[PDB]
Design a protein around this ligand. Structure first.
Ligand SMILES: COC(=O)c1cc(C(=O)OC)cc(-c2cc3c(=O)[nH]ccc3o2)c1
Ligand SMILES: COC(=O)c1cc(C(=O)OC)cc(-c2cc3c(=O)[nH]ccc3o2)c1
Lengths: 120, 121, 117, 120
């Protein structure tokens, strides 16, 4: 699959993931520093039988921003595809939703994009 | 009362979820739209200790659209919040990314919004 | 075309628009003069006649003669005619930020507009 | 500033004028999709940005109809202009097609484009 291992995005975030045989993604998401207060559980899913025509491998995962040290009352989902090779990449778009009151729900969700590589 | 239960979106998709004490979401999703049949595995995360100021509970989950019957070579993530009440609701926005070639990657990702209720609309 | 006129979203905003013969959208977006802003956009002036909606989009930059939020919203969507006509949209709201804060510069959401408030 | 000729990462050409009243006007030539030749664009920008180093917020729309083709669709780009040595406009976009109600769930694509003064 090529997905299991450590990945790094353009802002230094570190994505430590295992791609299980039946489509599970499990691991930890942390900052470049890696201190415990910066580490969070992640879980997701990937296509464990991708096409063989040169297409990428679809995947997604979620981090809720709560750990044993802090709680930002929010969660991010990344949706994207893995592209293999010597310059392997995971190319994603993400949504970060915070818990809000109904009056503030219109501004609950940020959108962005992250690219991950196997090299810092 | 809470996130654990059976939910339906505005199109009649069925979201059967369990919210574990450790912040885990697990369960199955059945889509009313697209190249999909029967149940698919989902996993995700939710805030197990939400704020006490009237705010909703943040959460997210992923389905990869492969099961024993079909494989669409794609995955959806839903990002949103649970809002308690007499008509409990989960309001989400979603991203659906297909595996593509690089030349087709610009059109790889659909976006939308789904609202879920424990009463089927 | 059915687009020209006054529209109301789900949260009390008012969208006043003219759909010109050349594909232009022009008008004002509100929420009193302190809360009114120019909008401009484009729509498909020759949509299909097969039950499909009419694609369109517009932008508001949140500056007027009284206030300036240093931000701008774009709405992308389609007009759906009939007895209960609608403009169904998704939107992106980008703020001007420093580079260090750019990762959190953009909100996303959805607005539904009706011809009755 | 914003007025000039810009190119996205895929080679699309964005020829824009930023007027004194906050107006964006010009033409767009897409490098992808059911598109050919130039299309009209209109939009808006913040004509009095902050003076603290922040970017200038802006947005614009293209409806994909011209004298040669009609894709029955429209794209909006929302983003900010970042001045300096190599000026850049960083955007996210939404591309909605006209659909029936039963197909509306798949009506909207999302992505991100970055524009510079140099061809990629
Ligand atoms: C409310 O968000 C938070 O509390 C929070 C906290 C941390 C943290 O503790 O860094 C150690 C990191 C992020 C974060 C978000 C994010 C994102 O959305 N796309 C790309 C990566 C990424 O990292 C968010
Ligand atoms: C007080 O200034 C305003 O009127 C104002 C200010 C902001 C702001 O502070 O963004 C920095 C945002 C909006 C706004 C409205 C709106 C809408 O109706 N649908 C979609 C998004 C959206 O954003 C309006």
């Amino acid at each position: 699959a090529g997905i299991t291992g450590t990945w790094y995005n353009q802002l230094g975030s570190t994505f430590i993931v295992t791609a299980g045989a039946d489509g599970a993604l499990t691991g930890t998401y942390e900052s470049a520093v890696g201190n415990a207060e910066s580490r969070y559980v992640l879980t997701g899913r990937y296509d464990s039988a991708p096409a063989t025509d040169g297409s990428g491998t679809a995947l997604g995962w979620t981090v809720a921003w709560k750990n044993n040290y802090r709680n930002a009352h929010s969660a991010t989902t990344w949706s994207g595809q893995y592209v293999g090779g010597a310059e392997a990449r995971i190319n994603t778009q993400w949504l970060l939703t915070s818990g809000t009151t109904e009056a503030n729900a219109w501004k609950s969700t940020l959108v962005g994009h992250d690219t991950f590589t196997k090299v810092k």
